[PDB]
Write a sequence for this structure.
């Protein structure tokens, strides 16, 4: 029964080279994705470029963090199994919901529809159903219907009506 | 020494068997990871969805692009012990900083105020405390207290004043 | 000669020592990433922490899904062949393109040009150039240069017209 162990020794030696080849392939593949994703470099010297998912602990406690320095994004929302992209590089396009603001700069503003009612052209035009002023008004031209007056009415230029009664 | 080399044979063989078992289990687990999570190999550039960073040379030089054809995200600020999510996937959640704009289409616009003030409502309404105009006007109603008729005026409808100077 | 096969067993033993070294090293690394980034363990129901691209089966077929607990992204557009620092997400700023709107809140609004030709301020003023109103107007203090008065006008206050024609 000597014949057994040596055949075994072979059943071993023969399997080791092939396993070595497989593990070498795996190690090379890890060398690939490591420079891709898992650089396994523990430092803040290169901003941890690539990708990182640090479950970092402070004196506060465990706090999650995900670090990527490459934007290169093109997203789609999955809600209801939907397939709508949202970040074409032309500065977002889904819709603007309720937004708080303190600085805006826009030439064109539209009320809505084949025709907007109250609009704000870059030319400075404005259509409205009201103009309430609690202060100064400097008007230049005008085609006006009713001007109800009961307070100071002093004139420096010209006035020419059709009927003047009083 | 009698059995030492012989026993090493079976010890090896058994250790290889178990080592191969754990390797097969783990390798199947990896086979499961890139199958769904990102991809691997040298997959062509047709759809290549999943997590992947590639450093391709350009005219300027390297380009480490990071591709994500994927879905809803939510992120928080980890700043030195901060825990407040800000833009967590609710369709432009909180607010915009200094922003330039081009065009819009909106029913309702306000100011934003505690004991508060002016707004641009869907129905043209505006209480603008200083409505300076340097061009044409088409008014169909108005109540003017202190009239400063500066240049040549005219009336098509009628004027009727209790007072008169001239 | 024969001593090669006997030597073969102990050579295999040393080779297994080396392979066990490397393999348990790698497995320990992956186990470290498991709660960090690998997420080898299952999630169950809704609990989820970390990363993973799950292409779940649905009655309609494929449903890829991605989930991030918390992150902070950099700013490089697809912009192949160009470096584009866009969407830094600093100070909650992205830059907005053409878009609709439903609800707005902005005390400060500009004309979308080098100066603000028409401006909205927390003071509530408006230096426009045309404001036509088909409804109510309440202008307290104002001047009128080239105006035609197309409907009724009544004064209960003082009247100091420059001239009267009729």
């Amino acid at each position: 029964e000597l014949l057994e162990k040596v055949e075994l020794t072979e059943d071993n030696a023969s399997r080791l080279e092939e396993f070595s080849k497989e593990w070498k392939d795996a190690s090379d593949k890890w060398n690939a994705m490591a420079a891709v994703k898992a650089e396994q470099t523990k430092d803040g010297k290169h901003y941890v470029a690539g990708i990182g998912l640090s479950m970092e602990d402070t004196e506060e406690g465990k706090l999650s963090q995900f670090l990527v320095a490459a934007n290169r994004i093109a997203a789609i929302d999955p809600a209801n199994g939907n397939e709508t992209p949202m970040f074409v590089a032309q500065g977002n396009q889904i819709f603007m919901n309720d937004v708080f603001l303190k600085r805006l700069t826009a030439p064109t503003i539209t009320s809505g529809g084949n025709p907007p009612a109250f609009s704000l052209t870059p030319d400075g035009k404005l259509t409205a159903k009201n103009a309430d002023i609690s202060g100064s008004v400097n008007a230049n031209s005008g085609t006006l219907s009713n001007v109800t007056i009961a307070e100071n009415c002093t004139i420096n230029g010209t006035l020419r009506a059709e009927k003047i009664v009083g």
In short: Chain A touches chain B through 99 residues (CB under 8 Å). Helices of chain A lie at 2-36. The longest strand of chain A covers residues 138-144. The CA atoms of residues 86 and 92 of chain A lie 6 Å apart.
